[PDB]
Amino acid sequence: LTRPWKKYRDGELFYGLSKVGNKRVPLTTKQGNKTMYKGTRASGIGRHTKFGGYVIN
Amino acid sequence: TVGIARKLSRDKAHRDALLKNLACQLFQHESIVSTHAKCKEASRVAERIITWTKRAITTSNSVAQAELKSQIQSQLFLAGDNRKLMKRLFSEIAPRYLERPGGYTRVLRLEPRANDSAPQSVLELVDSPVMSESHTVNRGNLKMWLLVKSVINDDANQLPHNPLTLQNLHKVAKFKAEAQLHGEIMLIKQVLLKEMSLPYDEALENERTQALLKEVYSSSLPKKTKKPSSYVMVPRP
Amino acid sequence: SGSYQHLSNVGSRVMKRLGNRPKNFLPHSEKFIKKSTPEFMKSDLKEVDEKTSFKSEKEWKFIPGDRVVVMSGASKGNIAVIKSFDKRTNSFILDENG
Amino acid sequence: AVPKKKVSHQKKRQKLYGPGKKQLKMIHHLNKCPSCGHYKRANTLCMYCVGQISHIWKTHTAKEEIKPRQEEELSELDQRVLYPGRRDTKYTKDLKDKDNYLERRVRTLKKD
Amino acid sequence: ARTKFTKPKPKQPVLPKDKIRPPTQLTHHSNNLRITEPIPPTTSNLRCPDDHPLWQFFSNKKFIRSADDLPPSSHIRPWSIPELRHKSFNDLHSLWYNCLREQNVLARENHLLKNIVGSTHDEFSELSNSIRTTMWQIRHVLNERE
Amino acid sequence: KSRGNTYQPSTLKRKRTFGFLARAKSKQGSKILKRRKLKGRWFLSH
RNA sequence: UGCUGACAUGAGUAACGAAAAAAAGGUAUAAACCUUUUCACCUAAAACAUAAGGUUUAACUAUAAAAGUACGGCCCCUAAUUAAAUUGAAUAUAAAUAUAUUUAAGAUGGGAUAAUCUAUAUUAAUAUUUAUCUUAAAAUAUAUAAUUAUAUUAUAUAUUAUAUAUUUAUAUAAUAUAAACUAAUAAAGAUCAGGAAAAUUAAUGUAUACCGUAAUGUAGACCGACUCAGGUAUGUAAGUAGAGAAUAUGAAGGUGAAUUAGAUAAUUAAAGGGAAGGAACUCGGCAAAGAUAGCUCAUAAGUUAGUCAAUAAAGAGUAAUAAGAACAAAGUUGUACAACUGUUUACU
RNA sequence: AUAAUUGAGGUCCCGCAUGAAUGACGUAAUGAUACAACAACUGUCUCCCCUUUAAGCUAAGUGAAAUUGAAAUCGUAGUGA
RNA sequence: UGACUGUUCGUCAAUUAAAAUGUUACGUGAGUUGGGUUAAAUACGAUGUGAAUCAGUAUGGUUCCUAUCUGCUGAAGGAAA
RNA sequence: AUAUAUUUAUUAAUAUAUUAUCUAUAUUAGUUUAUAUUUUAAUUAUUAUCAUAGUAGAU
RNA sequence: AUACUAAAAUUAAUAAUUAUAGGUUUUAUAUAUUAUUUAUAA
Ligand SMILES: [Mg+2]
Ligand SMILES: [Mg+2]
Ligand SMILES: [Mg+2]
Ligand SMILES: [Mg+2]
Ligand SMILES: [Mg+2]
Ligand SMILES: [Mg+2]
Ligand SMILES: [Mg+2]
Ligand SMILES: [Mg+2]
Ligand SMILES: [Mg+2]
Ligand SMILES: [Mg+2]
Ligand SMILES: [Mg+2]
Ligand SMILES: [Mg+2]
Ligand SMILES: [Mg+2]
Ligand SMILES: [Mg+2]
Ligand SMILES: [Mg+2]
Ligand SMILES: [Mg+2]
Ligand SMILES: [Mg+2]
Ligand SMILES: [Mg+2]
Ligand SMILES: [Mg+2]
Ligand SMILES: [Mg+2]
Ligand SMILES: [Mg+2]
Ligand SMILES: [Mg+2]
Ligand SMILES: [Mg+2]
Ligand SMILES: [Mg+2]
Ligand SMILES: [Mg+2]
Ligand SMILES: [Mg+2]
Ligand SMILES: [Mg+2]
Ligand SMILES: [Mg+2]
Ligand SMILES: [Mg+2]
Ligand SMILES: [Mg+2]
Ligand SMILES: [Mg+2]
Ligand SMILES: [Mg+2]
Ligand SMILES: [Mg+2]
Ligand SMILES: [Mg+2]
Ligand SMILES: [Mg+2]
Ligand SMILES: [Mg+2]
Ligand SMILES: [Mg+2]
Ligand SMILES: [Mg+2]
Ligand SMILES: [Mg+2]
Ligand SMILES: [Mg+2]
Ligand SMILES: [Mg+2]
Ligand SMILES: [Mg+2]
Ligand SMILES: [Mg+2]
Ligand SMILES: [Mg+2]
Ligand SMILES: [Mg+2]
Ligand SMILES: [Mg+2]
Ligand SMILES: [Mg+2]
Ligand SMILES: [Mg+2]
């Protein structure tokens, strides 16, 4: 019994309110494949190096 | 395999483990609450365990005691809090019932639990020690606590004791010493009267307890025929 | 009531729609707010939108501080000093004599 | 294996409320508690009287709480800087409100 | 598989006592080592200064300003565009950052109120908005001047 | 075998073949983008 | 078999979805939540780390901490491939557009330095898959520099004592269990003949960007209408025993379930045993039962010469002579069709 | 071949209505293909019996479905779309 | 009661007093089985230019139901005795 | 080893109770085992659970 | 006796008679060692 105050089935979900809804919301940083990179307009300084680093300008 | 004992809707291994756990837990504590069916079966196995210990204590045949000591071990889980169970059984539980021919446990019915209407009953060891080395009331002897409370109820209400309370007190007094019965009843009186916020007079309670026990231990069998029967034993012509 | 919403503006479209309800259907929401509040912060006057809330002192015919005579109420004939505006029901909060 | 016609009001009612077995029976086996003094079921025990005795056992054979020596020597300031307050979730908050889904037994009526 | 015909495996080889290299360690931990209760860290060992810069994030070293402490709305008014026109760049710069510093303080109080208490008093929010008005009025004056 | 699990999610494929740029950078994609806009749809693309 | 809304009958009936639980206390409010103990299940997982996915569901709002040295993305480079991009007049075409060349994008791939911790920038000059076989020799046991048999064939770092620039590094010499297993060159067998792309010095320089980080992830936290016995990628996966990741237990961990408590009628499903017969059953030995080694020997006819037949059937050696876990292991023959290994009607 | 065989194998040939890459014929191995025979084995059967677990039954909680013109919904004979 | 056949039928073997004839939706699939019969696959003989077809042949091949009423087998409660 | 009583002189010993039979280094990289090294890291007896009721013989 | 029901047995504790289930005792059955042995003393 996940919720001791709900002994019988009342339609309540395991978590949240609805299992369905819109999926066309804009992407964010925390979600996507490991190769995704959203960014936060917080770095326009320097130049990526050829090896894969950074150089602050 | 059919009719020997309740199946409890469990397999042989699960059922056996449950009874052993229940009997062992009955020993570690003094009274436990469980379903009526479980309590009855646990009562059966618990009584047999005590009897084996008594026979082992009393017997003079080395082989007899040696194998009984082993059989008792088979029907217990000696782990966790019951590691020292066997020594406790041989030192405390067994000597309490050396002169009693059976009936070391009693089952009293309680009201069913509201969740599933499952009948519930209390399994307790008869003649449990009310007092402790610390002079504090410990668990067990639910019947004795209730009996004293009924005595308190009659005393506070100024009514005579019911024949059933006297009879139950008589049953308790058969295997108990007079002084020990007097002392334990007084201790229960002080604790209860404190709980209900009632006056507790040591001298008055002592006199009342003396009056009660004198009635219990008195030997007055002839009470004549209580009711004039509409039937008469007549010799056959 | 931890939501972190005050620190950002997310859901501009939905917020605008909720806050710009059609005026024909305001009675739908008015019932909701009324039934869901205690009696000791509710007034029996209709609310005013930002476009229907008087701002110029000209519309505010009586600025607080001047004695007024109350008509059309259980306090008919009373004289009292308006103490403060309301800014939500577009009304005047009157003193003890009111 | 399906109903061929809708069951009328008459047939439904006499099927459920007709027989004596389907209808619940008056409780005639009630006695007076020798100790409590109130109503109780026959051949059973008074729950209140049993409950209060169990309470006596609990308070007289309770294990002292383990309160480590380290904690009681901390000032209020050190407790705050070292054990800050935290917020609870909806599930956790609801669980603590145990008075909304748990309720105690009802004291039985008194029998004269 | 372990069939009944299996025979025990031979014991592993053992190095003779005359060739076993002595271990590089002979002594080891102490066998009289007992468990002691944990010792909490105490702030009595600290010297948190009274001039610490983070104090600028609080108003008179107060957790959250009450109604009385907050500046009343009647007694206050944001700057006016003409008033800022009579100010030098350095002074306008000074005003901007003073506005920002109190904006940080008010933001800290709004967040604490709206994330724990949940009240909608928004007295701090209104004060921040009034400062925000002055901030853009400063920005307008500078652009018009340039 | 059992069916019903035809949609196996993947953000890369879902965005690459149904995303906004996956349609804004093609004649046919743009046409359906503007058709949804004219109908007044809130969510033009993925 | 009209559309929509509300309410009936079936009916308080079927069902509550693989399952071990029990007592005491939080709490004189608990079968369902928390703690302690007992019991049990999973344990080459129902454990521990992860990938993708997802209404953040987490130990939560005071919340998932990175210069890099096993930390990934980001960045350089490209494969398959993509492109309203580039080329009087690149070519073609009713429009849409297609084709060829360039350019750009595109990981599922490649990218020096590093615990004696390391320094990526600017300027100037010039490798498919696959095995470690045999001889040799050292060393060892019985025998007499000859012979039989035997672990080893290469590296992985500590100690002792010496020589070099001078207690920091190298070199030398001696000592130091077995079974698995790891990355690196070595050596070499077959044809099915085994990716693409982006320099060194000399000087100067480095104030270390942004994003990922919770928990679930063989599932109550994803795809399956459901807190659905279905589908879902990777590495460890204690020991004992074994050829083994089989099978048996289970150290540690996790776990024991939105259904409970009694008798277990007729009957149903999944299992155990069964006298005397032993296929008489049945369309039809369907189902069920049947294993006298699992190691070492031995192993016929036919035959395309391939221990194909063949793991041949029966048989033998090792304690077993009445039996006592689990797993592997289930006969012979004739005929029709097809050479054989394979593919096919997702769901008869 | 069995006590007894419309099934199986061998053989004979008025082949209603075989025949050579819509390949013809005989083999070895292979086949979860189809039919038949022998040994063992057994609850398939003579002939069913006992036992265990989950349901079925009872009590507490939650609570569907196809169906339904209205029903106060018996037997036999006759009649009758 | 067995062997043969999907067979009812029929031939045969061994018994008995006898191994009778029918109706009951050629009784009985909301009781079981499903070997024949037929749908999707495939091949052979014949027909057709073929696609396909057959009072042909052969291997393989999906059904389900928690009982409202009648009726029946058992067991109760109410009742007017 | 700790705690409580007794003897002895806070050491040592007796009685009782409780707790434990670990751990750490070396044998060339990792894991397991074995031995040596350090510590106090025991043998018996009788139970229990799992393997289809683990399995056979009885009943 | 039985699905739940229903039937049947007991609910004695007194001046005297009554055993329903559990437990206890006795006898017996089963299981399987035992005369080389079990309890006692002299
Ligand atoms: Mg993700
Ligand atoms: Mg078992
Ligand atoms: Mg038993
Ligand atoms: Mg779908
Ligand atoms: Mg695609
Ligand atoms: Mg109509
Ligand atoms: Mg029904
Ligand atoms: Mg039913
Ligand atoms: Mg049911
Ligand atoms: Mg409780
Ligand atoms: Mg395994
Ligand atoms: Mg293992
Ligand atoms: Mg995990
Ligand atoms: Mg590129
Ligand atoms: Mg990559
Ligand atoms: Mg993670
Ligand atoms: Mg993690
Ligand atoms: Mg699942
Ligand atoms: Mg989903
Ligand atoms: Mg364990
Ligand atoms: Mg888990
Ligand atoms: Mg379940
Ligand atoms: Mg048999
Ligand atoms: Mg037999
Ligand atoms: Mg037959
Ligand atoms: Mg037959
Ligand atoms: Mg078979
Ligand atoms: Mg041959
Ligand atoms: Mg097998
Ligand atoms: Mg032939
Ligand atoms: Mg073939
Ligand atoms: Mg094949
Ligand atoms: Mg198929
Ligand atoms: Mg014949
Ligand atoms: Mg046959
Ligand atoms: Mg033939
Ligand atoms: Mg031809
Ligand atoms: Mg052949
Ligand atoms: Mg019910
Ligand atoms: Mg018929
Ligand atoms: Mg017939
Ligand atoms: Mg043909
Ligand atoms: Mg088949
Ligand atoms: Mg297990
Ligand atoms: Mg009586
Ligand atoms: Mg009797
Ligand atoms: Mg008697
Ligand atoms: Mg009895």
- Kindly state the tokens that stand for B6: 């309740």
Q: Do D45 and B191 touch (CB under 8 A)?
A: no
Q: How far is the CA of A48 from the C1' of G76 (A)?
A: 9
Which residues on adjacent β-strands are paired with residue B106? B124
What number of other Cβ atoms are within 10 A of residue B189's Cβ?
A: 21
What number of other Cβ atoms are within 10 A of residue D44's Cβ?
A: 20
> D103, D32, C80: which is closest to B157 by C-alpha?
D32
Q: Is the dihedral of CA A48, A49, A50, A52 positive or negative?
A: negative
Residue E138 contacts residue E90 (beta carbons within 8 Å): no
Which residues on adjacent β-strands are paired with residue A27? none
In one-letter notation, the amino acid at residue D88 is D
Using the Cβ of A17 and the Cβ atoms of chain D, whether some distance falls under 8 Å is answered with no
Q: Is the dihedral of CA F14, F15, F20, F23 positive or negative?
A: negative
- E21 is near strand J: CB distance < 7 Å: yes
Q: In a 3-state reduction of DSSP, which class is residue D40? A: strand
Q: In a 3-state reduction of DSSP, which class is residue B110? A: strand
Q: In a 3-state reduction of DSSP, which class is residue D35? A: coil
What dihedral angle (degrees, nearest 10) is formed by the CA atoms of B143, B145, B147, B149?
A: -150
In angstroms, the CA C2 to CA E117 distance is 9
Closest residue of chain D to E115, computed from CA coordinates:
D87
In angstroms, the CA C47 to CA C28 distance is 14
| Residue F1 burial (C-beta neighbours within 10 Å; 0-12, 13-18, 19+) | exposed
Q: Do E111 and C6 touch (CB under 8 A)?
A: yes
In angstroms, the CA D34 to CA B165 distance is 8
> C94, C84, C78, C95: which is closest to C60 by C-alpha?
C84
Which CA distances in Å does E74 have to B40, C13, E78? 82, 36, 11
Q: Do D74 and E40 touch (CB under 8 A)?
A: yes
Using the Cβ of D106 and the Cβ atoms of chain B, whether some distance falls under 8 Å is answered with no
Residue B73 contacts residue B82 (beta carbons within 8 Å): no
In angstroms, the CA B45 to CA B123 distance is 12
Q: How far is the CA of D31 from the C1' of I78 (A)?
A: 30
- B17 is near strand G: CB distance < 7 Å: yes
Q: For C89, how many CA atoms within 13 A lie in the half-sphere containing its CB?
A: 12
Q: Do chains F and E meet with 3 or more Cβ pairs nearer than 8 Å?
A: no
Angle at CA of residue E125, ends E119 and E129, nearest 5°:
165
Residue B174 makes CB contacts below 8 A (sequence gap 6+) with none
Angle at CA of residue E127, ends E122 and E129, nearest 5°:
95
Residue B146 contacts residue D56 (beta carbons within 8 Å): no
Size of interface D-E (CB pairs under 8 A): 19
Closest residue of chain B to D106, computed from CA coordinates:
B114
Q: Give the residue carrying structure tokens 């002292």.
A: D64
Which residues on adjacent β-strands are paired with residue B83? none
Q: What are phi and psi of F20, to 5 degrees?
A: -65, -50
Which secondary structure element, helix H or strand E, spans residue B108, and what is its range?
A: strand B105-110
Q: Which A residues between 24 and 43 have a beta carbon under 7 A from any strand G atom?
A: 29-40, 42-43
Pairing of strands B120-125, B105-110: antiparallel
Look up residue B82 and give its DSSP letter: G
Q: Do C3 and E115 touch (CB under 8 A)?
A: yes
In one-letter notation, the amino acid at residue C81 is V
Q: In a 3-state reduction of DSSP, which class is residue B125? A: strand
In angstroms, the CA B103 to CA B43 distance is 9
Q: For residue C39, give how far its alpha carbon lies from the nearest alpha carbon of chain E (Å).
A: 19
| Residue-wise burial string across A28-51, b where 16 or more C-beta atoms lie within 10 A, e elsewhere | eeeeeeeeeeeeeeeeeeeeeeee
Residue A39 makes CB contacts below 8 A (sequence gap 6+) with A29
Residue C90 makes CB contacts below 8 A (sequence gap 6+) with C45, C47, C48, C52, C53, C54
Which secondary structure element, helix H or strand E, spans residue B123, and what is its range?
A: strand B120-125
Closest ligand to the CA of F15: 5
- Across the interface, of D35, D41, D50, the residue whose CB is closest to B153 is D35
In angstroms, the CA B51 to CA B57 distance is 10
- E143 is near strand J: CB distance < 7 Å: no
Q: How was this structure determined?
A: cryo-EM
- Across the interface, of E110, E114, E125, the residue whose CB is closest to C1 is E114
Q: For residue B120, give how far its alpha carbon lies from the nearest alpha carbon of chain D (Å).
A: 10
| Residue-wise burial string across D67-93, b where 16 or more C-beta atoms lie within 10 A, e elsewhere | eeeeeeebeeeeeeeeeeeeeeeeeee
For this entry, resolution in Å reads 3.2
Q: Do E43 and D78 touch (CB under 8 A)?
A: yes
Ordered alpha helix ranges (H), B75-177: 85-88, 94-96, 142-157, 163-174
In angstroms, the CA F46 to CA F34 distance is 14
Which secondary structure element, helix H or strand E, spans residue C94, and what is its range?
A: strand C92-94
Q: For D17, how many CA atoms within 13 A lie in the half-sphere containing its CB?
A: 5
Which CA distances in Å does B87 have to B53, B60, B105, B139? 11, 20, 20, 20
Residue C88 contacts residue C47 (beta carbons within 8 Å): yes
Q: Do A3 and D91 touch (CB under 8 A)?
A: yes
Residue B119 contacts residue B38 (beta carbons within 8 Å): no
